[PDB]
Amino acid sequence: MRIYYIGVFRSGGEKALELSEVKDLSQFGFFERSSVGQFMTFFAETVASRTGAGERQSIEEGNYIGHVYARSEGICGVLITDKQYPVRPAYTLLNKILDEYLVAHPKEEWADVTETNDALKMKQLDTYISKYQDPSQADA
């Protein structure tokens, strides 16, 4: 009943160019969190990959959901959370994140970015995914 992964990834070729990767390992132990973390990213990269930009993707898995929100430039962001985390707040979260990606550096500066990763990071997408763990974080 909480968000497990957040991030951003530009739709590349076979997979999504990992823009940024943030995880939430609350229920997963020290050893489990590692395996689940890989599960999160691989799934987050897949969504951005299956998301052909300008569209949204909510991947319903037998454990959690994988919300997705793409921009009209070429680089989209992914938001993977439990089914008990509506798409509306994920919309708000992926709203600040996508707009946040455009701010950290001009829209064209990245323009898909043939080279990105969690290295760049984003206080927004990170602090959001961390606190958003709850039902929605709809300004409460």
Q: Beta-strand percentage?
A: 15-25%
Biggest pleated-sheet summary: 5 strands, antiparallel
Q: Percent range for helical residues? A: 25-40%
The SSE order reads: EEHEEEHHH
The beta-strand count equals 5
Provide the number of structural domains: 1
Q: How large is the count of helical segments?
A: 4
Strand order of the largest sheet: 2-1-5-4-3
Name of the CATH class: Alpha Beta
First-to-last CA distance: 17 Å
Determine Rg (CA atoms, Å). 14 Å
Structural class: alpha+beta
Oligomer: monomer
Per CATH, the architecture is 2-Layer Sandwich
- The CATH homologous superfamily is termed Longin domain
CATH topology name: Beta-Lactamase
Shape: globular
Question: How would you describe what is shown here?
Answer:
It is classed as endocytosis/exocytosis. The entry lists the keywords endocytosis/exocytosis, transmembrane lipoprotein, prenylation, ENDOCYTOSIS-EXOCYTOSIS complex. The assembly is monomeric. The entry is titled "Solution structure of ykt6". This protein is an alpha+beta fold and 140 residues long. The protein has one domain (1-140): Longin domain (Beta-Lactamase, 2-Layer Sandwich). The protein contains four helices and five strands. It has a five-stranded antiparallel sheet.
